[PDB]
Design a protein around this ligand. Sequence first.
Ligand code: CLA
Ligand code: CLA
Ligand code: CLA
Ligand SMILES: CC1=C[C@H](O)CC(C)(C)[C@H]1/C=C/C(C)=C/C=C/C(C)=C/C=C/C=C(C)/C=C/C=C(C)/C=C/C1=C(C)C[C@H](O)CC1(C)C
Ligand SMILES: CC1=C[C@H](O)CC(C)(C)[C@H]1/C=C/C(C)=C/C=C/C(C)=C/C=C/C=C(C)/C=C/C=C(C)/C=C/C1=C(C)C[C@H](O)CC1(C)C
Ligand SMILES: CC1=C[C@H](O)CC(C)(C)[C@H]1/C=C/C(C)=C/C=C/C(C)=C/C=C/C=C(C)/C=C/C=C(C)/C=C/C1=C(C)C[C@H](O)CC1(C)C
Ligand SMILES: CC1=C[C@H](O)CC(C)(C)[C@H]1/C=C/C(C)=C/C=C\C(C)=C\C=C\C=C(C)\C=C\C=C(C)\C=C\C1=C(C)C[C@H](O)CC1(C)C
Ligand SMILES: CC1=C(/C=C/C(C)=C/C=C/C(C)=C/C=C\C=C(C)\C=C\C=C(C)\C=C\C2=C(C)C[C@@H](O)CC2(C)C)C(C)(C)CCC1
Ligand SMILES: CC1=C(/C=C/C(C)=C/C=C/C(C)=C/C=C/C=C(C)/C=C/C=C(C)/C=C/C2=C(C)CCCC2(C)C)C(C)(C)CCC1
Lengths: 67, 165, 74, 217, 194, 194, 74
Amino acid sequence: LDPQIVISGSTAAFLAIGRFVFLGYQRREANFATNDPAGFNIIDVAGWGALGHAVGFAVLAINSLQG
Amino acid sequence: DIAGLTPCSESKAYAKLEKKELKTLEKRLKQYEADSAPAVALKATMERTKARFANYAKAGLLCGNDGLPHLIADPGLALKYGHAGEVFIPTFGFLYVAGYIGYVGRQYLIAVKGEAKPTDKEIIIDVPLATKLAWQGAGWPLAAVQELQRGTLLEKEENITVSPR
Amino acid sequence: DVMQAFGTPEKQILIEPVFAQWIQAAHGKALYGFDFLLSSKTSAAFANGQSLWLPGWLDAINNNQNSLFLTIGP
Amino acid sequence: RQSWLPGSQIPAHLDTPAAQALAGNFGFDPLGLGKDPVALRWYQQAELIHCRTAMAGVAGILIPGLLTKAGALNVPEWYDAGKVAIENSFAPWGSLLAVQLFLCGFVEAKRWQDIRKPGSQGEPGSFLGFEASLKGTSELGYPGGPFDPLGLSKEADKWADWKLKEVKNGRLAMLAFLGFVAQKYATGAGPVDNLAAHLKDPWHVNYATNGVSLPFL
Amino acid sequence: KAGNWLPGSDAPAWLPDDLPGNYGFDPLSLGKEPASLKRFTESEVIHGRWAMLGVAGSLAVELLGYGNWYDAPLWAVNGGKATWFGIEVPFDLNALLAFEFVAMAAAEGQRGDAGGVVYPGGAFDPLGFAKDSSKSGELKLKEIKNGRLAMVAFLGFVAQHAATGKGPIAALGEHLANPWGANFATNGISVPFF
Amino acid sequence: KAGNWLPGSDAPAWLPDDLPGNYGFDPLSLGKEPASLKRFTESEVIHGRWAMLGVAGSLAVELLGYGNWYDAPLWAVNGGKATWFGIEVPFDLNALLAFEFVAMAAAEGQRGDAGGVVYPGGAFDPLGFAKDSSKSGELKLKEIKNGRLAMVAFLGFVAQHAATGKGPIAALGEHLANPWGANFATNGISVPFF
Amino acid sequence: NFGIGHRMQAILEAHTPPSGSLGAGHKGLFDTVNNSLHFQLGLALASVGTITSLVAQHMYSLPPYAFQAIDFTT
Ligand code: CLA
Ligand code: CLA
Ligand code: CLA
Ligand SMILES: CC1=C[C@H](O)CC(C)(C)[C@H]1/C=C/C(C)=C/C=C/C(C)=C/C=C/C=C(C)/C=C/C=C(C)/C=C/C1=C(C)C[C@H](O)CC1(C)C
Ligand SMILES: CC1=C[C@H](O)CC(C)(C)[C@H]1/C=C/C(C)=C/C=C/C(C)=C/C=C/C=C(C)/C=C/C=C(C)/C=C/C1=C(C)C[C@H](O)CC1(C)C
Ligand SMILES: CC1=C[C@H](O)CC(C)(C)[C@H]1/C=C/C(C)=C/C=C/C(C)=C/C=C/C=C(C)/C=C/C=C(C)/C=C/C1=C(C)C[C@H](O)CC1(C)C
Ligand SMILES: CC1=C[C@H](O)CC(C)(C)[C@H]1/C=C/C(C)=C/C=C\C(C)=C\C=C\C=C(C)\C=C\C=C(C)\C=C\C1=C(C)C[C@H](O)CC1(C)C
Ligand SMILES: CC1=C(/C=C/C(C)=C/C=C/C(C)=C/C=C\C=C(C)\C=C\C=C(C)\C=C\C2=C(C)C[C@@H](O)CC2(C)C)C(C)(C)CCC1
Ligand SMILES: CC1=C(/C=C/C(C)=C/C=C/C(C)=C/C=C/C=C(C)/C=C/C=C(C)/C=C/C2=C(C)CCCC2(C)C)C(C)(C)CCC1
């Protein structure tokens, strides 16, 4: 597992799922101006981006344990 | 067997305890003449001791390292390993007797409540009625289920007093 | 107390703490012979943690000189 | 009114016309178990099933036993027959009991639902056309229909007598089974031996001389 | 109503007769509230559809001689390689987990927003079976009944494996070979005292 | 009424006079409900038609020295191959089971969906025969009587084999050889004791 | 302050069993807890007190400090 590849891919995946899948649900649950059409503000990026980093490091961490 | 315990029948500590107990009784039986009433009494206690150690072992009781019988209370272990006369069966025996007392007493209170002076029937016991209920209490378990199913066992909350809250 | 006073300690009620001993067995203690979970070397819970903490834990929980899950009785 | 105890006070719940319509009503309920009508109905069903099971079982212990005593049969004693039968069976006892509970539970559930609501098992379209026959009669515990192949229940001038013989023979067979259990534990022999032994010396061979029934005398 | 689960019993009032697969079975009255029933109706259909795929897959793998549903993922904990209909799969657990998570997150997410839509149709009904209403009732009943049977089968697959350690087809083989000697009552686990 | 099964008995009113094979025999009152009688009527004809083919082929095989009905499937249980009229048939049990299941489910499904049609026509009635009702009635009585006879015959074959373990023709030979020595009462099974 | 996160009042208000087994559920509890220092102190004491007993049970069974288990008095 290439550290740069795992994390990079992980962050992108969460940013995508949070921008095209759960954005509506989160907004509905929610009941920083962004020119993004779907209104994806920076704080939203920070959140999903963080999730991605965590998941990425987890994969690398367990992989480093070799199994 | 269970919990690392050992049958009293195969415990060495169980055997040593029985010898220790009989040796105390024997050290005392000496100071008395053979037919003396004291001697007869110490002998009957020695016989009762021998029967107890034998009866307990035959019942298949398990003994700890202390050489003393331990009781198995898990329904699963007791039934699968022959230890149900230790806690399980006793439980249903007591529950029957205790419910018997409770159901009869409840039946008495209900009967005297419809009288002129219930308080008087609580200080002076209506013996005939009490004896009748005492005999009819043998079938309490079925009566208690039949009352539970008719909804006559409990009282409506609307009729029970409570504090302001 | 009465059974001890009348010199009949074999007549005392001594209920074994089987439910607690079963938990201790589950945690690894084999003194009770329940053989399950961490007390069973063929259990998955045993195999999964064999390369992690179990080894050190099992050595300690099976040592009767520390205070880790002391032996219990009536 | 026939009484289990001449001169005793019959419970009013057993003197009610519906209770008197019940077969075997000799006014016997000293513990007052059937005071509640709804319970009396469940207990009447329970007594009928116990009577019909005990009659079948006791017939399956005495009849084979007498025939074996004669020679016409070589059946083992009732208390040893399970081991003998399972010894050469196609299935272990556990598998045989599992199949028993499935088949008994099904027919017991249908009978149960018929007690909860009589005639319910005739629910149209519930049993491939057999539900029509699964409806019992106007009397609970007396299904008739396929259960009365010879139509003896159709003779109203003989109905009461037939039900009284069933209840009295059933109550006797229930006590005969309890006797078979008690005598087995007190003798170590079978019911046919116990009978022959007593008949040989009735004054010295009885429960008073068994060394168990009367531990005081 | 599809029928009665307990002949001669009264069907609960909360269960609509139009509800596909109504046999009056709600003894716990879990569906006595309408909103709870609406979720339970979508979840039964969803569970049934997964179960049917699962049981079909569980049977196929063994019937095609590729092992049983239980030993399928061992290659990951055995340091091997993925295999499908024999073909070796180039991805590994890490890749499988990622692809799936993204795929399932997208699909389920899309379905969740659509609401309780149980029968989507359109792109999901290409051959146009449930276009009308007359065919619908029976086809939805067949779907709910086959889903209920598959859910029970899968449960059976797990329970039987846990007690015997054999695959469904291998267990059928033993039961057919010795019906009275090879069943749950002979396992030594289902009934402890049997 | 084709007759009275029990002379001196009155026929159950629920049994229609035209009902083919109406000998007034419903002692347990099973056909009392019209719906039930309808299903039982169709089932009785189906049972008779199947049995009339079973008895035929059960006697034919033995008469043609190809074995008895009971030993016909043992080839599958052993390593033996399948034969028919001596000619060998190349199929394992599994193939036969699947082929029959699909074939039966198909034809039986069409019959079932039809709606209890006991007497179809055209393909099932070439060679005319049932075009005139006058002939139809007697022909329907002959079918039910021959079918009922064949149903009692098959049960006899199964019972005889269960008590003697021999083929139906082989029994007929044993009985004809010694009628008073070879009969149900001389098998040690039908009549106890002796 | 950033548009993301949970509103405790919304969480509590949503936790109401649909069958009415808990009445209005946790409705009004946000304000009940937020406006009652005694309610807040009751929870803190109940939690800290249970945690204090855990410290006692875990420190003796799993001694975290070197040469602590040999110091019986300590
Ligand atoms: C009330 C508290 C209590 C507690 C703490 C236990 C604890 C225990 N029971 Mg149990 N039991 C209880 C009440 C309790 N029982 C009651 C009221 C009954 C009457 C029905 C039983 C009937 C019972 C049976 C029949 C069995 C146990 C058994 C056991 C032991 C293992 C059971 C298990 O896996 O989880 C704990 C169990 C419970 C929390 C509740 C009941 C026990 C379940 C229902 C039995 C399932 C056991 C299962 C087969 C696991 C063991 C596998 C194998 C060794 C048999 C365990 C130490 C098993 C055993 O060890 O037998 C040798 C056994 O088979 N119990
Ligand atoms: C008809 C008699 C009777 C009955 C049916 C009950 C029933 C009950 N009592 Mg109770 N009680 C009784 C008498 C009775 N009590 C008396 C006389 C006292 C004064 C000591 C109490 C004091 C008492 C307390 C303090 C408590 C109960 C509680 C309870 C409930 C819990 C179970 C329990 O028994 O706990 C145990 C009850 C006892 C140990 C009291 C023993 C009373 C004796 C054994 C009963 C004898 C009654 C009478 C002499 C018999 C008359 C017979 C008649 C023919 C003349 C239960 C419903 C507990 C409860 O509320 O739980 C919800 C509870 O805390 N009771
Ligand atoms: C599955 C086979 C079958 C079925 C469905 C029927 C159905 C029917 N028969 Mg029939 N019958 C049969 C076999 C069958 N029969 C055989 C083999 C014989 C030759 C002995 C006869 C002789 C016969 C006569 C003489 C008459 C009927 C009549 C009838 C009709 C009257 C309604 C009725 O009796 O209730 C419904 C019937 C059933 C539900 C049969 C189902 C099978 C039973 C109920 C299950 C258990 C049977 C049990 C094992 C006993 C079997 C015999 C035993 C030795 C094994 C009915 C539609 C009467 C009629 O009017 O016909 C037009 C009538 O006159 N049958
Ligand atoms: C009424 C009254 C009222 C008031 O109030 C009170 C009082 C008095 C309480 C009451 C009384 C009561 C009584 C008396 C009761 C009794 C009961 C019984 C005995 C039952 C049995 C019951 C019994 C029964 C069922 C039985 C059954 C049996 C059977 C199945 C059999 C089986 C078998 C056989 C064949 C043989 C083999 O080899 C074995 C076996 C397996 C064993
Ligand atoms: C209704 C009611 C009401 C009343 O009131 C009461 C009561 C009774 C409570 C109730 C009932 C309930 C019930 C019965 C339930 C059941 C459930 C189930 C069984 C499910 C399953 C469920 C199941 C399911 C889904 C399944 C799934 C599966 C899947 C996806 C897949 C899988 C797989 C495969 C392919 C193969 C591989 O190699 C492996 C795997 C990966 C493993
Ligand atoms: C929507 C759409 C649209 C368009 O337009 C059209 C189309 C395309 C047509 C459609 C689609 C559809 C689909 C996909 C379907 C699927 C289905 C399935 C798979 C089912 C299963 C289904 C399945 C099922 C039921 C299952 C069943 C099972 C069972 C019973 C089991 C049995 C058993 C057990 C337990 C165990 C043992 O050991 C063995 C055995 C014996 C084996
Ligand atoms: C009506 C009535 C009414 C009133 O109510 C009363 C009562 C009496 C209840 C009733 C009655 C009923 C009855 C009697 C029934 C009977 C009988 C029978 C036998 C049936 C069968 C029936 C039978 C049948 C179908 C059969 C069939 C058969 C088949 C297909 C086939 C076979 C075979 C062959 C070819 C050859 C090979 O190698 C093998 C096999 C494959 C094996
Ligand atoms: C009928 C009767 C009475 C009783 C009245 C009432 C309402 C009693 C209430 C009972 C209630 C509400 C019980 C509620 C829950 C009880 C539960 C959950 C049962 C717990 C028992 C367990 C877990 C069994 C434990 C074990 C078993 C198998 C037996 C032993 O082996 C010991 C042990 C612990 C291992 C009246 C009036 C007091 C008067 C009198 C007679
Ligand atoms: C705008 C736009 C776009 C896009 C762009 C981009 C590219 C974005 C991205 C951005 C990004 C790039 C994001 C990211 C984020 C991330 C983050 C925010 C992270 C964080 C981290 C964390 C939180 C961690 C933590 C921790 C540590 C520290 C230690 C260990 C453990 C852990 C890991 C947990 C497009 C073209 C589409 C369209 C148009 C416009």
